[PDB]
């Protein structure tokens, strides 16, 4: 049930040691799944192929 908590606290112990041993912006908190960032997707080989209920 709490199998992840002890492991992530051990990861918090690894990231606290890494925090002290570096000029740090810490971020040990888990952030939820963000909205998707912008990307330019190219259609050079992979052509935008049409479909329809032909059927």
């Amino acid at each position: 049930c709490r199998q992840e908590f002890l492991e992530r606290v051990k990861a918090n112990a690894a990231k606290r040691a890494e925090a002290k041993a570096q000029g740090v912006a810490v971020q040990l908190k888990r952030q939820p799944a963000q909205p998707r960032e912008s990307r330019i997707v190219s259609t050079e080989g992979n052509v935008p192929q049409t479909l329809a209920p032909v059927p």
Partner: protein
């Protein structure tokens, strides 16, 4: 009133499968949001995908090429009914594709009691050459020098009382 939309989707790019096949189709709707929703609804039926598995890459308004030339359209329609779904081919004479599908949706509701959620527009095509126009009610208007009157016209009153006894001449 309608609007035609090119809507594309390519089931979200993950590991080991980069750049999928980009599934493109033309969607008649009233606005962009409805077009998007209709596209996902069609994708779930054409193959086994979901709304969360993909992404709308491009939504674009397809304006009509020559909105001044009267065309002879033939629309392949299928729709869910009181019984099982079935194909239908109706021929429509109109100026634009948006206006022709508009007249179809109102006619489908009028003669078959099918709302917007039932109708699957398959293919709207121009019939280029006449005498290949199949339906007789459309071929009715393709005769040489068609001169027909509009007998018995109503005169729209602005008041309640008239002083003439109206003349429905034309």
């Amino acid at each position: 009133h309608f609007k035609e939309y090119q809507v594309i989707g390519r089931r979200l790019p993950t590991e080991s499968v980069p750049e999928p096949k980009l599934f493109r189709m033309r969607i008649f709707a009233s606005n962009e949001v409805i077009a998007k929703s209709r596209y996902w609804y069609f994708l779930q039926k054409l193959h086994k995908v979901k709304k969360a598995s993909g992404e709308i890459v491009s939504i674009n308004q397809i304006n009509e090429a020559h909105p001044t030339k009267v065309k002879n359209f033939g629309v392949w329609v299928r729709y869910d009914s009181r019984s099982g779904t079935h194909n239908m081919y109706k021929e429509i004479r109109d100026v634009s594709r948006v206006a022709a599908v508009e007249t179809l949706y109102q006619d489908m509701a009028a003669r078959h009691r099918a709302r917007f959620r039932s109708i699957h527009i398959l293919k709207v095509a121009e019939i280029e050459k006449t005498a290949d126009v199949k339906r007789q009610y459309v071929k009715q208007f393709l005769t040489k020098d068609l001169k027909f009157p509009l007998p018995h016209r109503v005169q729209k009153s602005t008041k309640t009382f008239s002083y003439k006894r109206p003349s429905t001449f034309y």
